Design a protein around this ligand. Structure first.
Ligand code: NA
Ligand code: NA
Length: 284
């Protein structure tokens, strides 16, 4: 019997814990964790993502500051805003919604976030610490994937894991978390000659490239754990993953639905990182 990796249910359970911890903090020290969110421009999908993050903060009682900037904002203005958020002791985490406009150097803007407030885990200091087994902020999507697997008692150590997608924000950090946990890890992408070579061997397949039906049942090992990070908005309004869910469930042992699988876990991971940032700030 295949098991649904119910990321939505796990995220809601974690949110209940966050809400309770924040309630205690608010009464004990009369402060709350606070997330600063910067949105540049009016990209529809970016607006939706910002609203998802703000609504999540509201569900757990986390404070937030949403700063909306025009699409033609200068890099200097964005940097000056980030500097002020870095120095404001009442700001726990700082998040810049991506993508930024082409005239903005995204890597420079993200490196201006103080690493102690980098709740997205995108600062190279945090990425480098992850790669060298030093504790710091994990990117939210890989963090949520590992947390979901932990909840379902999926063993990582000694397992063969195939990661499809090699992005800086998902596939690469996820591969590092898997390796650090003792898996043998393959990272594939658009230039891979035969992804099925890697997926048919894998105990765990994680895919996040944005291509409907890329992962088919015939590409999987019987009993495999399948983590579908894709979120594809089809022309007709449907939202599907990168896995052929209907057929793959005939072979997989565990599988995330899309939507309501990895998505809610990414969001709750951002909330957890903001609380961690607050707690580390108070201890320092
Ligand atoms: Na300053
Ligand atoms: Na393990």
């Amino acid at each position: 019997g295949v098991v649904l990796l119910d990321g939505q249910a796990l995220a809601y359970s974690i949110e209940k814990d966050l809400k309770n911890k924040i309630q205690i903090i608010t009464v004990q020290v009369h402060k709350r964790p606070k997330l600063a969110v910067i949105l540049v421009g009016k990209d529809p999908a970016s607006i939706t993502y910002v609203n998802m993050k703000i609504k999540a903060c509201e569900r757990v009682g986390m404070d937030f500051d949403l700063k909306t900037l025009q699409e033609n904002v200068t890099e200097a203005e964005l940097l000056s805003l980030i500097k002020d958020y870095n120095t404001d002791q009442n700001i726990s985490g700082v998040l810049v919604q991506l993508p930024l406009p082409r005239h903005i150097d995204s890597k420079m803007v993200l490196e201006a976030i103080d690493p102690s407030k980098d709740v997205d885990g995108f600062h190279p200091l945090n990425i480098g610490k992850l790669c060298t087994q030093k504790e710091s902020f994990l990117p939210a999507t890989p963090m949520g994937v590992m947390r979901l697997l932990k909840h379902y008692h999926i063993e990582i150590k000694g397992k063969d894991v195939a990661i499809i997608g090699a992005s800086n924000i998902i596939g690469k950090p996820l591969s590092m978390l898997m390796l650090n946990a003792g898996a043998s890890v393959s990272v594939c992408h658009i230039l891979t000659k035969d992804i099925s070579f890697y997926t048919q061997n894998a105990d765990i397949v994680c895919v996040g490239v944005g291509k409907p039906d890329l992962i088919k049942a015939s590409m999987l090992k019987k009993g495999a754990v399948v983590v579908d990070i894709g979120i594809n908005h089809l022309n007709d309004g449907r939202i599907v993953g990168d896995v052929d869910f209907t057929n793959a469930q005939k072979v997989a042992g565990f599988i995330t639905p899309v939507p309501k699988g990895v998505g809610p876990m990414t969001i709750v991971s951002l909330l957890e990182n903001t609380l961690i940032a607050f707690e580390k700030q108070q201890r320092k």
